[PDB]
Design a protein around this ligand. Structure first.
Ligand SMILES: [Zn+2]
Ligand SMILES: [Zn+2]
Ligand SMILES: [Zn+2]
Ligand SMILES: [Zn+2]
Length: 269
């Protein structure tokens, strides 16, 4: 009874350092990112419910502990990013930060009628304790300071995150970009939803937001959308330079715009 899509998304990925105190601890098709400090760590996204043990194992393999995670951040409320959150919270006793809209999904373990994939995803374990992250909201664990950027469209509650990571004197701007791809259950119309009427305005404004972010190192919620595995392969002999590309967020938005244009053409004809 295996789901080939979930199986592919959740496939093992050996964890690795991206830049400075920023590490990848996710899976082949779903990102999770660890940002460390001696005062504890920040963890971004939780994958599917069955991703949580893999993320935890990956944190350990790097030489860190889930017990030292003091803040967990969410991108959006779909099961493939929020499903593992309840377990990660239990194992770390960390608070989870999410947008007001995503937090509604997390609290019930299922999305509402305004989600493009409402009625088309399984329920997942509800997240017990949360903090709301609004646009421009700043969060910290010791010296690592994260800023939330509202980037809805793929869901009404989409959030992207920025912070800086340093490898001594050189600092780079890190970006965890939420999904901004216009995909849905069949029959949903981004151009004509009565439950999510702001979908197009959201996507356009998110495109604007993401494309002008300071952006040295990009990790997308679905890693292949930022070519992470090509970049990782390059890093074997290339080093951290392989992950650095100041044009990455602009290219990410350009690709999403292209997808949206095609999608709107399909909805109209
Ligand atoms: Zn599935
Ligand atoms: Zn999603
Ligand atoms: Zn996803
Ligand atoms: Zn339905």
């Amino acid at each position: 009874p295996g789901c080939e899509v979930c199986a592919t998304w959740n496939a093992d990925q050996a964890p690795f350092r991206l830049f400075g105190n920023t590490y990848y601890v996710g899976m082949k098709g779903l990102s999770s990112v660890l940002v460390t400090s001696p005062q504890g760590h920040v963890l971004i996204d939780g994958g599917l419910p069955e991703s949580a043990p893999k993320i935890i194992a990956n944190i350990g393999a790097l030489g860190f502990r889930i017990e030292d995670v003091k803040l967990i951040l969410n991108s959006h409320g779909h099961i493939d990013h929020a499903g593992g959150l309840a377990e990660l919270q239990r194992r770390s006793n960390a608070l989870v930060a999410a947008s007001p809209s995503a937090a509604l999904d997390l609290a019930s373990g299922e999305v509402g009628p305004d989600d493009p994939q409402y009625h088309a995803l399984p329920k997942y374990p509800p997240v017990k304790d949360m903090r709301l992250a609004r646009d421009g909201g700043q969060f910290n664990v010791g010296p690592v300071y994260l800023t939330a950027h509202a980037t809805p469209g793929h869901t009404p509650g989409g959030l992207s995150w920025t912070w800086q990571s340093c490898d001594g004197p050189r600092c780079l701007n890190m970006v965890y970009a939420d999904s901004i791809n216009a995909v849905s259950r069949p029959g949903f119309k981004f151009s004509a939803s009565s439950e999510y009427p702001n979908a197009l305005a959201d996507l356009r404004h998110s495109f604007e937001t993401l494309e002008k972010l300071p952006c040295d190192v990009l990790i997308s919620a679905h890693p292949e959308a930022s070519q992470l595995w090509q970049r990782l392969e390059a890093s074997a002999t290339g080093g951290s330079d392989a992950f650095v590309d100041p044009q990455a967020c602009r290219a990410y938005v350009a690709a999403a715009r292209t997808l949206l244009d095609s999608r709107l053409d399909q909805e109209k004809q």
